Write an enzyme that holds these catalytic residues in place. Structure first.
Site, mmCIF file in Angstrom:
data_model
loop_
_atom_site.group_PDB
_atom_site.id
_atom_site.type_symbol
_atom_site.label_atom_id
_atom_site.label_comp_id
_atom_site.label_asym_id
_atom_site.label_seq_id
_atom_site.Cartn_x
_atom_site.Cartn_y
_atom_site.Cartn_z
ATOM 1 N N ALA A 28 111.802 40.325 50.511
ATOM 2 C CA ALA A 28 113.258 40.266 50.640
ATOM 3 C C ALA A 28 113.964 41.069 49.556
ATOM 4 C CB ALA A 28 113.729 38.825 50.608
ATOM 5 N N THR A 34 109.088 37.082 59.888
ATOM 6 C CA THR A 34 110.199 38.051 60.090
ATOM 7 C C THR A 34 109.890 38.955 61.262
ATOM 8 O OG1 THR A 34 110.956 38.256 57.786
ATOM 9 C CG2 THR A 34 111.303 40.137 59.224
HETATM 10 C C1 GDT Z 1 110.237 38.562 56.453
HETATM 11 C C2 GDT Z 1 108.943 37.671 56.534
HETATM 12 C C3 GDT Z 1 107.724 38.568 56.517
HETATM 13 O O1 GDT Z 1 107.884 39.682 57.096
HETATM 14 N N1 GDT Z 1 106.521 38.326 55.925
HETATM 15 C C4 GDT Z 1 106.162 37.176 55.206
HETATM 16 C C5 GDT Z 1 105.892 37.469 53.681
HETATM 17 C C6 GDT Z 1 107.120 37.931 52.911
HETATM 18 O O2 GDT Z 1 106.638 38.717 51.819
HETATM 19 C C7 GDT Z 1 107.972 36.728 52.397
HETATM 20 C C8 GDT Z 1 109.475 36.995 52.100
HETATM 21 N N2 GDT Z 1 109.965 35.913 51.262
HETATM 22 C C9 GDT Z 1 110.669 36.135 50.152
HETATM 23 O O3 GDT Z 1 110.971 37.264 49.736
HETATM 24 C C10 GDT Z 1 111.082 34.898 49.373
HETATM 25 N N3 GDT Z 1 111.068 35.204 47.907
HETATM 26 C C11 GDT Z 1 109.880 35.274 47.209
HETATM 27 O O4 GDT Z 1 108.775 35.103 47.768
HETATM 28 C C12 GDT Z 1 109.884 35.536 45.759
HETATM 29 C C13 GDT Z 1 108.763 35.597 45.077
HETATM 30 C C14 GDT Z 1 108.653 35.801 43.620
HETATM 31 C C15 GDT Z 1 107.434 35.828 43.057
HETATM 32 C C16 GDT Z 1 107.170 35.951 41.593
HETATM 33 C C17 GDT Z 1 106.648 34.555 41.099
HETATM 34 C C18 GDT Z 1 107.829 33.552 40.920
HETATM 35 C C19 GDT Z 1 107.409 32.128 40.456
HETATM 36 C C20 GDT Z 1 108.707 31.278 40.320
HETATM 37 C C21 GDT Z 1 108.445 29.830 39.853
HETATM 38 C C22 GDT Z 1 109.796 29.053 39.735
HETATM 39 C C23 GDT Z 1 112.486 34.370 49.822
HETATM 40 C C24 GDT Z 1 112.879 33.085 49.033
HETATM 41 O O5 GDT Z 1 113.475 35.377 49.551
HETATM 42 C C25 GDT Z 1 110.237 36.979 53.407
HETATM 43 O O6 GDT Z 1 110.586 35.871 53.849
HETATM 44 N N4 GDT Z 1 110.487 38.148 54.062
HETATM 45 C C26 GDT Z 1 111.200 38.121 55.342
HETATM 46 C C27 GDT Z 1 112.441 39.049 55.305
#
Ligand code: GDT
EC number: 3.4.25.1
Lengths: 242, 198, 241, 244, 233, 212, 250, 204
Positions: F49, F1
């Site tokens: 996110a 991101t």
């Molecule tokens: C920006 C990217 C960034 O700045 N850094 C990379 C790391 C970031 O934290 C990743 C973020 N991705 C998400 O939010 C994704 N969703 C999840 O990771 C959800 C996680 C839940 C975890 C609990 C365990 C669940 C197990 C389930 C088994 C079925 C996407 C999909 O939204 C990201 O991409 N940030 C961007 C904005």
């Protein structure tokens, strides 16, 4: 003495009834609904010439499509407004949509009977009922323009036109005749302004009276003195017209 | 850590504080003011954990301002420093402690003397001619141990400082983007906006 | 524990405990506030039922909520402290959370709320106090004067008075203050205030205290002299006729 | 329910008065008289011991003059028992202030807290007010010598000379007649004794029916000192002021 | 007499009565009439909606508690909300936890006990509403009458509210007839509308004045208002 | 991101990418990393996110409530502290968000506030947050002048994200532009990096390394 | 349930009196007489064991109780109220002193504690004041011997000698006559027995009189040996026999 | 890691002929870094003295606490607290925090105003009392102080001799401890007067 949640032999709740009395002593407030919007009007009623009449807020905004007018003990209305506003904004946060005017109303009425010194129904903490009534007006995609009357009893009715406050009984009678399903917003504006003039102890002017309305296009707006002053003039003229 | 220095001369207290704010790999800001005024004659510099740092300072600020309003009187530095040591000593044994170290410098209008206080997140308080938090102390204490005199003037003190800031830019690993200096005296608190080349 | 509903409705729709709270206000010393064109002045009278007081220490009637807002009252003294303290804390809290000092209108609305709350909360009696809150909003020069009462109602005034014989002094002000042309000077604004108090203070140089608030946290309370002088000049106004 | 036996100790009268406070004051009016006179170089506290006997141990007694701090003391008028509950919380508040700020608590600050506590029972809780009135006599370096008075209502004010308890109207007038700003401690001490001597409901004013205290700054030191007189001390000063 | 024993619900009169509860019951008689009647296949509710002005609306008298249960009210509208809402939760709890439809008989028991609690502890107040609950469960159609006292009764039909006795008698008379209107809702609804018009006086039932509710064998509790009730007036 | 926001003469420029990942897996290339708090406020999404999307929508509600209550549009400094204080209440719980609150109030002019879940709140002129922040800083830092035309500033933004989308594996998808003026912000389209890259290469001659 | 009496049952009357405290004192007046006398090397407290049936065994009851090894109490008023106050007193002497300084409290302070208990019973919600008055006598290293009287109001004062209950007025007068600041403990015990004789209608012997003294340390009453500093309790209740023997030299 | 070894410092108390002595160093450091050379660890409440070694913040806290307590004690008891009683107060004050103690090592010294008897006593961090008749030691260099005392010490020294002895024990003990030193102060207590002297020692 006698519990705040006691029943009278006629089947009514004393506190609620007495609450309605304080309301009769309140400022006048009128509401007229038209297929073009809803008009709300209130009597400022200044207890002195030194009092800056525009610091008198008796018509507030709940949301962009909901506003209300209050009559009676107004300091009481404060927490009802806060609740109503929170309810409106909250519903939006959770459903990504505007709160329906009726539901907003129903929400406020739910606080009404939450009083006592130990009422076995939940945790109703509030020593007495609210001493103020409200006129809720707004528009929503389900039932268009709406006007509501919410009381300290906890019940509410929908009206095409309604007046509450010191001059109500008579003013309501006026509305009974004057109102008709084809009124225009302007007509309703003058009508509200006229009835306020009749029931008011004072000479109606753009300083001890105040108008406002809700239209699907611009939402809830409160008329500034100038806009009102003119409508007042336009009213005197058409009156002397016959 | 960050650079938090404090020196008390003849009639004032001088506080120097690094302007850099780095987060991992990037230096996000070069003009940060790691300080809060607690009262017209009391200034407090701070350094520590990311959130705790500001939240604590402002909290302490709000309380001292409230005492001022309520008493229509300004608490002596000593007293203000005692209130702060207490707040931290509570924090140290609480659920989630404040990891903030602070330097408190003020002018006691009643004793007509400047005072410097050093307090760490544990609630350790000590009064000193000059002090610092973090590693800064490691290269500056010997400088001051050498060149410090109690009757120095604010000007003399400001030079002794420049001397320290120089050693720090020479031997310290991190680029702290210079310091912001402030003087506290009988007339209050003012900032030396010309030290980036004084 | 105790939660008896003390403020309740009576047959005629009145909350007697709140009304009686007002009576306590009517009995308290008088207080007045008049806004000029660049300032606001607050004046309060001092009882004389006893005299051998040490005015240095004895708590004064006009308090500072913050550095730009003041508050005077009429009613029970003890009750004022509770209100002042609460508002003082709200002042600091608001700065902290909004990074900006409370406006006079806001600080007022807060105090009114506390009062209204004490009128429909079990186990407590309403505040036997009415207040005058004045000052200037942050980075603004237009003077602010507000009034609150036990019921919880509040509004703004060009000039207003509360307390004993407030009926009198209000009449005086109603026919001596022109919104068209307000006391354009700090001086003539302080005068209109002493004049108005003298209508009821009945010769009391040491019985009257003034406090002038100017934009940007410029609050100061005149001493007997500065006041006494105003009194002197005013008595000549009458005699010179 | 219980609403039947509730006195509602916290409501307004139609005249905007607080019954209980009023009545509690009525109670205080029958309490031994206590006077506080503040001179230029010190403060004096004197009170009349209500009800005494040949058998009453006076050397061990103290029913009106209590030490709160090292620089603050109080004279009481009302229910001794009630007074103590409040006196103790004050002594604590004094210490907390010290522990937190590392400075002695300003006389007014201690007075305000104590008065706020009283005010509380006046506004919520369904409890009776404390039947007590205080005359605080202390010294601090932010206002020097100070004399305060607080009553059941929770209100407090400052005074040059003041008395509480019984025959206050008489005592106040006598004080208001002979008090002079440039007064000296011993002057105040005399005015004090004399005032009581004239308001006393008793035959004569003997030492065994009195309590005395002074807050002076002994020049040969530079620090303010509290001195609560002993029976033999009051007896001496009594003879000297010419009351033998 | 009565004055010394009606200050609250925690007091018995010397004759063993609970006035506060009785005053509550009064609120119901002061309320607008409503009728309930059932057969072996359907259960119906008919209510006379009252209004304030002629500029106002006709307050709702019928509430749906679940797909197989609902009730009409007479008395303090706010209380009906509280109670029907409580009944909704109970219907819901039965579904979620046991995957079972709450029986009308049980809904009644639940209501009774909730009401009762407010008549034995200081501080409470009886409810000031009467309810007629209809529903179709495993044992057929059902009709219950709920009184603030706490008494819930199962009947073939009944009416509550001002001038209710008129309708009640008509039903008490027509009993053997309507109790057999099976496999034909429109007929049970008519017998319903007729019974209720037996309590009229002031006016005549209009389109935006009448309100009908019907539940049964293959009929999920549904409400009818305005134009919808046209074919019955 | 990759998300950036800088202040200049013409007000404020806000640019972000739209790639959402879960490890090396690209979940979405169509994420909206700019939360429209209201006609005068903007929020950027970096870190978790849901943490951003949720708490920022929440912020919007809080702001609206402030305006109804105070009959006066909320200041940027305050909307940033509401988010700041909320997030700090959860310090330690694991929230993950690095964000920028951007706005234009008559009282403050163009203003940018950096707010992360650490409790850090910073006011500044240029801010780049995200796994691609250093790549945007590189471009942005060396081509910034307070005297950029609202048109040249808009491009510098779009291009700073292009830089980051290229090098950073976690950034990409498309670019979203916003222009902050006092009358509010103005959207300036969605620019698919897929096409924008080639276009810039040809027209600008940059990305000379890549083979086209 | 739940005590709904969260308000004061003792309030101020228009005259300024506190009814319940007054009525409570009335109850003290009605109670059996009891007195106390301070000598130069001890204190003595006594009362009359007014048996409430010849079938009742007055030994299975103590009007004179031990608070700490150097403090004893006695009353006049309502027996049950005294009883619970003794328990509370013994406890508070521990919880608020011995457990902190490792030594028993000094008379005045323990007395101060008891007073607080009563004072609260004067203002707390839903309760009546205590219907008794206590004569507490004791001795501590830095204060010597002392005798205090605690009233239902919660007030207390020190006495050289005093009495309360029925014939208090008469008794007080008699004591004011006989008392002096040179009495030896025995003398006071004698005087005590005398003063008591007037207030006693029927029988007057070691089985109807209950008396205790706060005199010297009774090492013999310690229960163990081997710790120099522990010298034994100063409080000692006299035996039926001990009383009579003196009643003869009366 | 070890709280009792973050700041450093030592305290020692000795009894002589109708007199007691208590001394401490003046160091206050943060690990290897020396921060203050004016951090005294001896305090007094009336004629009773209290030395406190350990985590500085707790050393300060306990001082403020015992000030507070001894104050209210004098107001109610109407006399100054004695060494023996104060010891008990300290002990229970510490055990009050048995499961999250103050990381300190208190030392009490004084003469009983009423008996004229000298009294010193030590405590562990949770209040365990050690009432010696010769000497009590405490601090990061306590092992050294033990060796120093066990040797140097002898009964009934005079105020002038006890000073030499307690000063020698303190000094030489501190010099073998990296966390102690940087100055020292010694208190000599007699039923009538108290003399406070500062010692000259290495500053490394
Ligand atoms: C920006 C990217 C960034 O700045 N850094 C990379 C790391 C970031 O934290 C990743 C973020 N991705 C998400 O939010 C994704 N969703 C999840 O990771 C959800 C996680 C839940 C975890 C609990 C365990 C669940 C197990 C389930 C088994 C079925 C996407 C999909 O939204 C990201 O991409 N940030 C961007 C904005």
């Amino acid at each position: 003495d006698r519990g705040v949640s006691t029943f009278s032999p006629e089947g009514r709740l004393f506190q609620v009834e007495y609450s309605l009395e304080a309301i009769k002593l309140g400022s006048t407030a009128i509401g007229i609904a038209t297929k073009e919007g809803v008009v709300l009007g209130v009597e400022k009623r200044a207890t002195s010439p030194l009092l800056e009449s525009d610091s008198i807020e008796k018509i507030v905004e709940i949301d962009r499509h909901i506003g209300c007018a209050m009559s009676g003990l107004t300091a009481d209305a404060r927490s009802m407004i806060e609740h109503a506003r929170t309810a409106a904004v909250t519903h939006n946060l959770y459903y990504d949509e505007d709160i329906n005017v009726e539901s907003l109303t129903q929400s406020v009425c739910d606080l009404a009977l939450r009083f006592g010194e130990g009422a076995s129904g939940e945790e109703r903490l509030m020593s007495r009922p609210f001493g103020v009534a409200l006129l809720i007006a707004g528009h929503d995609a389900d039932d268009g323009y709406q006007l509501f009357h919410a009381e300290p009893s906890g019940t509410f009715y929908r009206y095409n036109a309604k007046a509450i406050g010191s001059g109500s009984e008579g003013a309501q009678a006026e509305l009974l005749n004057e109102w008709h399903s084809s009124l225009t917003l302007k007509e309703a504006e003058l009508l509200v302004l006229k009835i306020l003039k009749q029931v008011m102890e004072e000479k109606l002017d753009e300083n001890n009276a105040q108008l406002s309305c809700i239209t699907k296009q611009d939402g809830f707006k409160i008329y500034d003195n100038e806009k009102t002053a003119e409508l007042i003039k336009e009213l005197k003229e058409k009156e002397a017209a016959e | 850590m960050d650079i938090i220095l404090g020196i008390r001369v003849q009639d004032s207290v001088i506080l120097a504080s690094s302007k850099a704010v780095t987060r991992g790999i990037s230096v996000l800001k070069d003009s940060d003011d790691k300080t809060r005024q607690l009262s017209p004659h009391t200034l407090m510099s701070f350094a520590g954990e990311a959130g705790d740092t500001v939240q604590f300072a402002e909290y302490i600020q709000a309380n001292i301002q409230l005492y001022s309003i309520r008493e229509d009187y300004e608490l002596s530095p000593q007293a203000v420093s005692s209130f702060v040591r207490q707040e931290l000593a509570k924090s140290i044994r609480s659920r989630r402690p404040y990891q903030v170290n602070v330097l408190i410098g003020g002018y006691d209008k009643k004793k007509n003397k400047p005072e410097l206080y050093q307090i760490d997140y544990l609630g350790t308080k000590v009064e000193l001619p000059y002090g610092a938090h973090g590693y800064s102390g490691f290269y500056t204490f010997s400088l001051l141990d050498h060149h410090y005199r109690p009757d120095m003037t604010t000007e003399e003190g400001l030079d002794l400082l420049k001397l320290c800031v120089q050693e720090l830019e020479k031997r310290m690993p991190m680029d702290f983007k210079g310091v912001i200096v402030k003087i506290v005296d009988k007339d209050g608190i003012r900032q030396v906006d010309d030290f980036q080349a004084q | 524990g105790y939660d008896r509903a003390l403020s309740i409705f009576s047959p005629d729709g009145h909350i007697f405990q709140v009304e009686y709270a007002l009576e306590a206000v009517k009995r308290g010393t008088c207080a007045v506030g008049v806004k000029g064109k660049n300032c606001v002045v607050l004046g309060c009278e001092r009882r004389s039922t006893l005299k051998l007081q040490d005015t240095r220490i004895t708590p004064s009637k006009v308090s500072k909520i913050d550095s730009h807002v003041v508050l005077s009252f009429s009613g029970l003294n003890a009750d004022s402290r509770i209100l002042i303290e609460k508002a003082r804390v709200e002042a600091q809290s608001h700065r902290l959370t909004l990074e900006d000092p409370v406006t006079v209108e806001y600080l007022t609305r807060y105090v009114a709320g506390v009062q209204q709350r004490y009128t429909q909360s079990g186990g407590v009696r309403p505040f036997g106090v009415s207040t005058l809150i004045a000052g200037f909003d942050p980075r603004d020069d237009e003077p602010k004067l507000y009034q609150t009462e036990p019921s919880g109602i509040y509004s703004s005034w060009s000039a207003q008075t509360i307390g004993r014989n407030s009926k009198t002094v209000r009449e005086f002000l109603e026919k001596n203050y022109d919104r068209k042309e307000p006391p354009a000077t700090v001086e003539e604004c302080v005068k209109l205030t002493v004049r108005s108090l003298l209508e009821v203070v009945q010769t009391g140089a040491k019985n009257i205290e003034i406090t002038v608030v100017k934009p940007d946290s410029d609050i100061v309370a005149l001493s007997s002299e500065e006041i006494n002088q105003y009194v002197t000049q005013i008595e000549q106004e009458k005699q010179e006729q | 329910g219980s609403r039947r036996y509730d006195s509602r100790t916290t409501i307004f009268s139609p005249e905007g008065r607080l019954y209980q406070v009023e009545y509690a004051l009525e109670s205080i009016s029958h309490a031994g008289t206590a006077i506080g006179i503040m001179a230029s170089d010190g403060i004096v506290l004197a009170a009349e011991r209500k009800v005494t006997s040949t058998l009453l141990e006076q050397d061990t007694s103290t029913e009106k003059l209590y030490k709160l701090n090292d620089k603050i003391a109080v004279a009481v008028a009302g229910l001794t028992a009630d007074a103590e509950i409040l006196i103790n919380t004050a002594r604590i508040h004094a210490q907390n202030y010290l522990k937190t700020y590392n400075e002695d608590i300003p006389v007014e600050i201690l007075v305000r807290r104590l008065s706020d506590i009283k005010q509380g029972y006046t506004q919520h809780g369904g409890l009776r007010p404390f039947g007590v009135s205080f005359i605080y006599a202390g010294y601090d370096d932010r206002y020097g010598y100070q004399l305060y008075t607080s009553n059941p209502s929770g209100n407090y004010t400052g005074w040059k000379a003041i008395s509480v308890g019984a025959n206050t109207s008489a005592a106040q007038t006598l004080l208001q007649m002979d008090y002079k700003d440039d007064m000296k401690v011993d002057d105040a001490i005399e005015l004090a004794l004399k005032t009581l001597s004239k308001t006393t409901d008793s035959s004569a004013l003997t030492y065994d029916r009195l309590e005395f205290a002074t807050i002076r700054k002994g020049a040969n030191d530079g620090e303010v000192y509290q001195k609560i007189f002993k029976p033999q001390e009051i007896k001496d000063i009594l003879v000297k002021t010419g009351i033998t | 007499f009565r004055n010394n024993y009606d200050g609250d619900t925690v007091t018995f009169s010397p004759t063993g009565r609970l006035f506060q509860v009785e005053y509550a019951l009064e609120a119901i008689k002061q309320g607008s009439v409503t009728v309930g009647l059932r057969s072996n296949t359907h259960a119906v509710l008919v209510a006379l909606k009252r209004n304030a002005d002629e500029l106002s609306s006709y307050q709702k008298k019928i509430i749906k508690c679940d797909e197989h249960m609902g009730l009409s009210l007479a008395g303090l509208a706010p209380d009906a909300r509280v109670l029907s809402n409580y009944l909704r939760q109970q219907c819901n709890y039965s579904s979620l936890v046991f995957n079972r439809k709450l029986a009308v008989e049980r809904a009644g028991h639940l209501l009774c006990d909730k009401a009762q609690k407010n008549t034995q502890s200081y501080g409470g107040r009886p409810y000031g509403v009467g309810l007629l609950i209809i529903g179709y469960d495993k044992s057929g159609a059902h009709l219950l009458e709920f009184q603030p006292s706490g008494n819930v009764t199962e009947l073939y039909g009944t009416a509550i509210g001002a001038r209710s006795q008129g309708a009640k008698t008509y039903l008490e008379r027509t009993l053997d007839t309507f109790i057999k209107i099976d496999g034909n809702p429109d007929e049970l609804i008519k017998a319903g509308v007729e019974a209720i018009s037996q309590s009229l006086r002031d006016e005549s039932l209009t389109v935006d004045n009448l309100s009908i509710a019907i539940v049964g064998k293959d009929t999920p509790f549904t409400i009818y208002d305005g134009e919808a009730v046209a074919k019955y007036i | 991101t990759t998300t950036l926001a800088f202040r200049f003469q013409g007000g404020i420029i806000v640019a972000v990418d739209s790639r959402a990942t879960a490890g090396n897996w690209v979940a979405s290339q169509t994420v909206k990393k700019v939360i429209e708090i209201n006609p005068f406020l903007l929020g950027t999404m970096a870190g978790g996110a849901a943490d951003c999307q949720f708490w920022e929508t929440w912020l919007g509600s809080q702001c609206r409530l402030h305006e109804l209550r105070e009959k006066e549009r909320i200041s940027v400094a305050a909307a940033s502290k509401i988010l700041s204080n909320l997030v700090y209440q959860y310090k330690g719980a694991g929230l993950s968000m690095g964000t920028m609150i951007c706005g234009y109030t008559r009282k403050e002019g163009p203003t940018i506030y950096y707010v992360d879940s650490d409790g850090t709140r910073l006011k500044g002129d240029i801010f780049c947050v995200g796994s691609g922040q250093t790549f945007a800083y590189g471009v942005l830092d060396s081509n910034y002048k307070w005297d950029l035309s609202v048109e040249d500033a808009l491009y510098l933004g779009k291009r700073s994200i292009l830089a980051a989308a290229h090098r950073d594996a976690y950034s990409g998808g498309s670019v979203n532009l916003y222009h902050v003026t006092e009358d509010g912000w103005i959207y300036h389209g969605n620019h698919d990096v897929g096409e924008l890259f080639w276009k810039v290469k040809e027209e600008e001659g940059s990305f000379n390394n890549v083979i086209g | 349930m739940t005590d709904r009496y969260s308000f004061s049952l003792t309030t101020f009357s228009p005259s300024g009196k506190l009814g319940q405290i007054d009525y409570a004192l009335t109850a003290v007046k009605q109670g059996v007489t009891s007195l106390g006398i301070k000598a130069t090397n001890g204190v003595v407290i006594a009362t009359e064991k007014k048996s409430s049936s010849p079938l009742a065994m007055s030994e299975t009851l103590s009007k004179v109780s031990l608070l700490t090894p150097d403090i004893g109490a006695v009353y006049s008023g309502m027996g049950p109220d005294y009883r619970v106050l003794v328990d509370k007193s013994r406890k508070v002497a521990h919880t608020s002193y011995k457990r902190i300084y490792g030594e028993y409290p000094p008379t005045k302070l323990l007395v101060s504690e008891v007073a607080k208990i009563m004072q609260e019973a004067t203002q707390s919600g839903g309760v009546r004041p205590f219907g008794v008055s206590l004569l507490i006598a004791g001795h501590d290293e830095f204060n010597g011997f002392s005798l205090y009287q605690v009233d239902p109001s919660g007030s207390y004062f020190p006495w050289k000698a005093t009495a309360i209950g029925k014939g208090s007025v008469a008794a007080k007068t008699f004591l004011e006559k006989r008392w002096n600041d040179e009495l030896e403990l025995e003398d006071a015990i004698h005087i005590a027995l005398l003063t008591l004789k007037e207030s006693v209608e029927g029988e007057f012997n070691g089985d109807t009189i209950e008396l205790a003294i706060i005199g010297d340390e009774n090492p013999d009453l310690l229960g163990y040996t081997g710790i120099p500093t522990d010298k034994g309790p100063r409080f000692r209740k006299l035996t039926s026999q001990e009383i009579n023997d003196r009643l003869e030299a009366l | 890691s070890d709280p009792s070894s973050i700041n450093g410092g030592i305290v020692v108390a000795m009894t002589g002929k109708d007199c007691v002595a208590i001394a401490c160093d003046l160091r206050l450091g943060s690990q290897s870094l020396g921060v203050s050379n004016k951090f005294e660890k001896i305090f007094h409440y009336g004629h009773v003295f209290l030395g406190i070694t350990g985590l500085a913040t707790d050393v300060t806290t306990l001082n403020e606490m015992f000030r507070y307590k001894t104050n209210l004690y004098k107001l109610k008891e109407e006399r100054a607290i004695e060494p023996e009683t104060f010891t008990q107060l300290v002990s229970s004050s510490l055990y009050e925090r048995r499961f999250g103690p103050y990381f300190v090592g208190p030392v009490v010294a004084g003469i009983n105003s009423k008996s004229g008897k000298p009294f010193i006593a030590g405590f562990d961090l949770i209040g365990c009392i050690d009432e010696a008749k010769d000497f009590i030691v405490s601090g990061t260099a306590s092992d050294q102080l033990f060796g120093m005392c066990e040797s140097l010490y002898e009964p009934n020294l005079e105020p002038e001799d006890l000073f030499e002895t307690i000063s020698q024990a303190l000094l030489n003990a501190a010099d073998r401890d990296a966390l102690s030193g940087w100055g020292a102060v010694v208190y000599i207590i007699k039923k009538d007067e108290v003399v406070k002297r500062y010692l000259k020692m290495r500053q490394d």
